[PDB]
Amino acid sequence: MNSAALKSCLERENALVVEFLHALEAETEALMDRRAHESLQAAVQRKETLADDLAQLGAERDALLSGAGLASGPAGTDAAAAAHPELGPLWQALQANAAQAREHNQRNGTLIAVNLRHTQESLDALRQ
Amino acid sequence: NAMNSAALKSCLERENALVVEFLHALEAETEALMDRRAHESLQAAVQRKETLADDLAQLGAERDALLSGAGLASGPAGTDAAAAAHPELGPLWQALQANAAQAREHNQRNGTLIAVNLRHTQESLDALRQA
């Protein structure tokens, strides 16, 4: 219980503050970490570009269908596949892939909300 | 008019390849939405701060126990007196106060960033509630 004791105490207190500063640096890093956000943005942007490209190809298919005197959309394409059954497998795969895409897409649209709510609750628990 | 079977095959191939690229983009979207690396890092930082803050506050009792025994005031006042009387503690005490002030400011900044991220999260939720 002297001046060396007081020096020991200060040293250790300072050691904890410095460690706390490094913990703070880590907290700031996590708060500023936008990797997940950029990944999401990049995937959403791909999705938009591809969605536009598919609508264009959808119009192309309908133009060919209409050109041949057939109905547009799935019904017309069903009739094209009956008349040209060599196209059946491709039409069936497109349909199956589109249904999986729609399901997966609707699931991600919900999952965005889940993600936002996970984040909101984790952050709101730090509030006090 | 007659169906151009070749033209239709071509169109259906390109569509199906785009849908497939779209399934890949969807997988990337799910992966991004499931990425909690920042969340986990935050939690660990916060738990670390808590233990350190707790140890620090308790270690204040040792300082006050020493100041009280030497008949000095507690807290910063007594420690100023002690650093004056034992100058070899000056740099250490100055550093500790400066480091601590720095920590308080940084802690406040991080509290603000939490508020910023929470604002952005609510706005993002408000956006889905619309669309």
Tab-separated table of C-alpha atoms in Angstrom:
chain	number	residue	atom	x	y	z
A	1	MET	CA	0.000	0.000	0.000
A	2	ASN	CA	2.327	2.711	-1.294
A	3	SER	CA	3.461	4.652	-4.366
A	4	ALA	CA	4.588	1.481	-6.223
A	5	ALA	CA	1.198	-0.016	-5.399
A	6	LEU	CA	-0.483	3.044	-6.855
A	7	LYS	CA	1.691	2.765	-9.963
A	8	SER	CA	0.695	-0.910	-10.353
A	9	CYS	CA	-2.955	0.087	-10.100
A	10	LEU	CA	-2.655	2.861	-12.684
A	11	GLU	CA	-0.747	0.515	-15.066
A	12	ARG	CA	-3.486	-2.058	-14.881
A	13	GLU	CA	-6.251	0.464	-15.207
A	14	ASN	CA	-4.506	1.860	-18.258
A	15	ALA	CA	-4.066	-1.677	-19.615
A	16	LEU	CA	-7.857	-2.230	-19.386
A	17	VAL	CA	-8.673	1.117	-20.998
A	18	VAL	CA	-6.312	0.285	-23.874
A	19	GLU	CA	-7.934	-3.126	-24.255
A	20	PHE	CA	-11.318	-1.378	-24.177
A	21	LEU	CA	-10.132	0.979	-26.901
A	22	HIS	CA	-9.293	-2.085	-29.041
A	23	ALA	CA	-12.707	-3.595	-28.244
A	24	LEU	CA	-14.244	-0.224	-29.347
A	25	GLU	CA	-12.222	-0.430	-32.630
A	26	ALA	CA	-13.668	-3.890	-33.166
A	27	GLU	CA	-17.231	-2.636	-32.466
A	28	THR	CA	-16.716	0.248	-34.965
A	29	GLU	CA	-15.389	-2.226	-37.555
A	30	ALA	CA	-18.505	-4.433	-37.159
A	31	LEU	CA	-20.835	-1.387	-37.361
A	32	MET	CA	-19.134	-0.191	-40.552
A	33	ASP	CA	-18.932	-3.678	-42.151
A	34	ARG	CA	-21.009	-3.438	-45.353
A	35	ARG	CA	-19.903	-6.698	-47.054
A	36	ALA	CA	-23.313	-8.325	-46.650
A	37	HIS	CA	-24.976	-5.172	-47.888
A	38	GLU	CA	-22.765	-4.921	-50.979
A	39	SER	CA	-23.232	-8.612	-51.765
A	40	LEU	CA	-26.992	-8.150	-51.542
A	41	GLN	CA	-26.928	-5.045	-53.720
A	42	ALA	CA	-24.801	-6.801	-56.321
A	43	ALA	CA	-27.129	-9.832	-56.445
A	44	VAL	CA	-30.258	-7.633	-56.594
A	45	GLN	CA	-28.722	-5.680	-59.493
A	46	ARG	CA	-27.959	-8.881	-61.395
A	47	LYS	CA	-31.512	-9.960	-60.745
A	48	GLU	CA	-32.959	-6.732	-62.165
A	49	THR	CA	-30.795	-6.992	-65.344
A	50	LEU	CA	-31.718	-10.609	-65.876
A	51	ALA	CA	-35.442	-9.836	-65.162
A	52	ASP	CA	-35.369	-7.160	-67.873
A	53	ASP	CA	-33.544	-9.482	-70.286
A	54	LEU	CA	-36.153	-12.229	-69.633
A	55	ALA	CA	-39.076	-9.884	-70.273
A	56	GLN	CA	-37.423	-9.062	-73.620
A	57	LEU	CA	-37.052	-12.752	-74.464
A	58	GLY	CA	-40.636	-13.348	-73.306
A	59	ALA	CA	-41.723	-10.727	-75.909
A	60	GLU	CA	-39.538	-12.474	-78.506
A	61	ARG	CA	-41.227	-15.817	-77.809
A	62	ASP	CA	-44.675	-14.192	-78.016
A	63	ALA	CA	-43.777	-12.471	-81.295
A	64	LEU	CA	-42.758	-15.848	-82.829
A	65	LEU	CA	-45.873	-17.454	-81.400
A	66	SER	CA	-48.137	-14.697	-82.767
A	67	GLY	CA	-46.276	-14.811	-86.086
A	68	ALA	CA	-47.241	-18.524	-86.365
A	69	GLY	CA	-50.944	-17.797	-85.636
A	70	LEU	CA	-50.691	-19.275	-82.133
A	71	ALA	CA	-51.686	-17.959	-78.709
A	72	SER	CA	-49.051	-16.064	-76.719
A	73	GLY	CA	-47.516	-17.115	-73.388
A	74	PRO	CA	-47.608	-20.631	-71.896
A	75	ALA	CA	-50.740	-21.756	-73.796
A	76	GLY	CA	-49.264	-20.889	-77.153
A	77	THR	CA	-45.935	-22.436	-76.231
A	78	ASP	CA	-47.721	-25.615	-75.077
A	79	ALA	CA	-49.304	-25.726	-78.555
A	80	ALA	CA	-45.916	-25.147	-80.210
A	81	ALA	CA	-44.432	-28.012	-78.170
A	82	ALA	CA	-47.259	-30.324	-79.257
A	83	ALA	CA	-46.668	-29.418	-82.943
A	84	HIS	CA	-42.871	-29.611	-82.506
A	85	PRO	CA	-42.189	-32.126	-79.766
A	86	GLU	CA	-38.408	-31.777	-80.197
A	87	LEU	CA	-38.970	-28.542	-78.217
A	88	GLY	CA	-40.866	-30.248	-75.380
A	89	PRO	CA	-37.884	-30.916	-73.088
A	90	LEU	CA	-36.565	-27.373	-73.354
A	91	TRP	CA	-40.018	-25.917	-72.662
A	92	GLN	CA	-40.425	-28.255	-69.707
A	93	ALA	CA	-37.040	-27.260	-68.242
A	94	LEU	CA	-37.754	-23.545	-68.668
A	95	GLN	CA	-41.107	-23.998	-66.904
A	96	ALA	CA	-39.568	-26.005	-64.090
A	97	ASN	CA	-36.646	-23.570	-63.656
A	98	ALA	CA	-39.015	-20.581	-63.678
A	99	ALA	CA	-41.208	-22.157	-60.973
A	100	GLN	CA	-38.145	-22.783	-58.769
A	101	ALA	CA	-36.981	-19.216	-59.422
A	102	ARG	CA	-40.378	-17.778	-58.440
A	103	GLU	CA	-40.511	-19.830	-55.243
A	104	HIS	CA	-36.925	-18.936	-54.315
A	105	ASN	CA	-37.517	-15.299	-55.153
A	106	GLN	CA	-40.611	-15.044	-52.944
A	107	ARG	CA	-38.705	-16.754	-50.161
A	108	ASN	CA	-35.849	-14.179	-50.390
A	109	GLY	CA	-38.411	-11.342	-50.330
A	110	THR	CA	-39.631	-12.629	-46.955
A	111	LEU	CA	-36.068	-13.382	-45.847
A	112	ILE	CA	-35.075	-9.713	-46.399
A	113	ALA	CA	-37.688	-8.807	-43.762
A	114	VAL	CA	-36.322	-11.494	-41.409
A	115	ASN	CA	-32.788	-10.116	-41.882
A	116	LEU	CA	-33.879	-6.552	-41.241
A	117	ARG	CA	-35.725	-7.663	-38.093
A	118	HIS	CA	-32.759	-9.702	-36.816
A	119	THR	CA	-30.584	-6.614	-37.259
A	120	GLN	CA	-33.169	-4.264	-35.714
A	121	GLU	CA	-33.558	-6.427	-32.580
A	122	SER	CA	-29.796	-7.030	-32.078
A	123	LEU	CA	-29.116	-3.309	-32.395
A	124	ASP	CA	-32.103	-2.299	-30.262
A	125	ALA	CA	-30.889	-4.601	-27.444
A	126	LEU	CA	-27.644	-2.551	-27.283
A	127	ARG	CA	-29.743	0.640	-26.605
A	128	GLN	CA	-29.421	0.815	-22.789
B	1	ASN	CA	-47.946	-18.768	-91.207
B	2	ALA	CA	-45.785	-21.745	-90.138
B	3	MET	CA	-43.908	-21.983	-86.796
B	4	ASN	CA	-40.183	-21.293	-87.085
B	5	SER	CA	-39.136	-24.235	-84.866
B	6	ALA	CA	-35.486	-23.223	-84.982
B	7	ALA	CA	-36.307	-19.694	-83.877
B	8	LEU	CA	-38.385	-20.969	-80.977
B	9	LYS	CA	-35.701	-23.412	-79.807
B	10	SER	CA	-33.196	-20.571	-79.828
B	11	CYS	CA	-35.474	-18.347	-77.799
B	12	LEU	CA	-36.332	-21.066	-75.284
B	13	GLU	CA	-32.566	-21.913	-74.856
B	14	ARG	CA	-31.643	-18.323	-74.152
B	15	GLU	CA	-34.595	-17.928	-71.764
B	16	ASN	CA	-33.695	-21.034	-69.848
B	17	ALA	CA	-30.059	-19.945	-69.596
B	18	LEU	CA	-31.212	-16.590	-68.165
B	19	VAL	CA	-33.512	-18.281	-65.679
B	20	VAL	CA	-30.543	-20.407	-64.595
B	21	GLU	CA	-28.374	-17.306	-64.177
B	22	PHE	CA	-31.301	-15.895	-62.227
B	23	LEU	CA	-31.286	-18.945	-59.905
B	24	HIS	CA	-27.560	-18.326	-59.348
B	25	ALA	CA	-28.253	-14.644	-58.486
B	26	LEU	CA	-30.979	-15.801	-56.124
B	27	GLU	CA	-28.487	-18.124	-54.348
B	28	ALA	CA	-26.112	-15.166	-54.000
B	29	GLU	CA	-28.989	-13.090	-52.575
B	30	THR	CA	-29.818	-15.789	-49.969
B	31	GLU	CA	-26.117	-16.063	-49.066
B	32	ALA	CA	-25.905	-12.311	-48.511
B	33	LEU	CA	-29.110	-12.294	-46.409
B	34	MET	CA	-27.766	-15.126	-44.246
B	35	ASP	CA	-24.327	-13.491	-43.745
B	36	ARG	CA	-24.233	-12.607	-40.020
B	37	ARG	CA	-20.433	-12.142	-39.807
B	38	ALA	CA	-20.825	-8.471	-38.913
B	39	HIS	CA	-23.547	-9.357	-36.367
B	40	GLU	CA	-21.284	-11.928	-34.644
B	41	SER	CA	-18.307	-9.552	-34.607
B	42	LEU	CA	-20.460	-6.866	-33.050
B	43	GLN	CA	-21.695	-9.231	-30.334
B	44	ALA	CA	-18.146	-10.293	-29.456
B	45	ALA	CA	-16.916	-6.687	-29.303
B	46	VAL	CA	-19.813	-5.753	-27.041
B	47	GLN	CA	-19.265	-8.677	-24.656
B	48	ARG	CA	-15.531	-7.822	-24.510
B	49	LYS	CA	-16.314	-4.164	-23.627
B	50	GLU	CA	-18.668	-5.245	-20.885
B	51	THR	CA	-16.094	-7.468	-19.076
B	52	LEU	CA	-13.399	-4.827	-19.462
B	53	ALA	CA	-15.721	-2.004	-18.290
B	54	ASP	CA	-16.645	-4.160	-15.251
B	55	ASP	CA	-13.023	-4.949	-14.410
B	56	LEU	CA	-12.080	-1.331	-14.885
B	57	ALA	CA	-14.823	-0.004	-12.597
B	58	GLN	CA	-13.860	-2.525	-9.958
B	59	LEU	CA	-10.182	-1.744	-10.256
B	60	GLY	CA	-11.208	1.790	-9.231
B	61	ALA	CA	-11.784	0.393	-5.749
B	62	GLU	CA	-8.072	-0.493	-5.492
B	63	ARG	CA	-7.059	3.038	-6.430
B	64	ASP	CA	-9.554	4.463	-3.877
B	65	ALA	CA	-8.380	1.974	-1.234
B	66	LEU	CA	-4.810	3.224	-1.788
B	67	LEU	CA	-5.772	6.908	-1.794
B	68	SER	CA	-7.911	6.446	1.329
B	69	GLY	CA	-5.085	4.717	3.215
B	70	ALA	CA	-2.629	7.527	2.438
B	71	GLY	CA	-5.277	10.025	3.660
B	72	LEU	CA	-6.044	11.533	0.212
B	73	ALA	CA	-9.382	12.301	-1.495
B	74	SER	CA	-10.780	9.590	-3.735
B	75	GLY	CA	-11.122	9.670	-7.517
B	76	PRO	CA	-9.299	12.139	-9.826
B	77	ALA	CA	-8.594	14.698	-7.057
B	78	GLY	CA	-6.662	12.368	-4.777
B	79	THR	CA	-4.826	10.876	-7.742
B	80	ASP	CA	-3.771	14.400	-8.917
B	81	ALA	CA	-2.366	14.996	-5.434
B	82	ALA	CA	-0.598	11.630	-5.498
B	83	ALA	CA	0.960	12.285	-8.975
B	84	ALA	CA	2.142	15.706	-7.756
B	85	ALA	CA	3.771	14.183	-4.661
B	86	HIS	CA	5.197	11.149	-6.570
B	87	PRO	CA	6.111	12.595	-10.023
B	88	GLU	CA	7.072	9.221	-11.445
B	89	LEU	CA	3.322	8.556	-11.682
B	90	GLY	CA	2.710	11.665	-13.834
B	91	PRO	CA	2.982	10.223	-17.395
B	92	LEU	CA	1.042	7.117	-16.410
B	93	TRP	CA	-1.797	9.147	-14.867
B	94	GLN	CA	-1.879	11.583	-17.734
B	95	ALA	CA	-2.000	8.664	-20.225
B	96	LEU	CA	-4.756	6.862	-18.285
B	97	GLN	CA	-6.974	9.988	-18.239
B	98	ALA	CA	-6.312	10.694	-21.905
B	99	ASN	CA	-6.898	7.044	-22.901
B	100	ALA	CA	-10.101	7.010	-20.833
B	101	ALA	CA	-11.445	10.239	-22.350
B	102	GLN	CA	-10.643	8.806	-25.772
B	103	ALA	CA	-12.587	5.646	-24.884
B	104	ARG	CA	-15.598	7.641	-23.703
B	105	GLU	CA	-15.743	9.624	-26.935
B	106	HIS	CA	-15.322	6.482	-29.061
B	107	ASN	CA	-17.975	4.686	-27.078
B	108	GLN	CA	-20.309	7.636	-27.703
B	109	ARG	CA	-19.468	7.594	-31.441
B	110	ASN	CA	-20.327	3.901	-31.569
B	111	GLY	CA	-23.597	4.540	-29.793
B	112	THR	CA	-24.389	7.024	-32.540
B	113	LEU	CA	-23.479	4.500	-35.312
B	114	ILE	CA	-25.794	1.987	-33.692
B	115	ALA	CA	-28.507	4.661	-34.018
B	116	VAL	CA	-27.591	5.246	-37.664
B	117	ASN	CA	-27.731	1.542	-38.497
B	118	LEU	CA	-31.046	1.197	-36.605
B	119	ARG	CA	-32.475	4.165	-38.561
B	120	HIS	CA	-31.395	2.611	-41.887
B	121	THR	CA	-32.877	-0.791	-40.794
B	122	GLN	CA	-36.291	0.785	-39.941
B	123	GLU	CA	-36.310	2.799	-43.163
B	124	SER	CA	-35.488	-0.408	-45.070
B	125	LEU	CA	-38.401	-2.153	-43.283
B	126	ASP	CA	-40.693	0.816	-44.048
B	127	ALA	CA	-39.719	0.359	-47.730
B	128	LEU	CA	-40.859	-3.329	-47.837
B	129	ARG	CA	-44.081	-2.490	-45.991
B	130	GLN	CA	-44.759	-0.164	-48.995
B	131	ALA	CA	-43.749	-2.375	-51.976
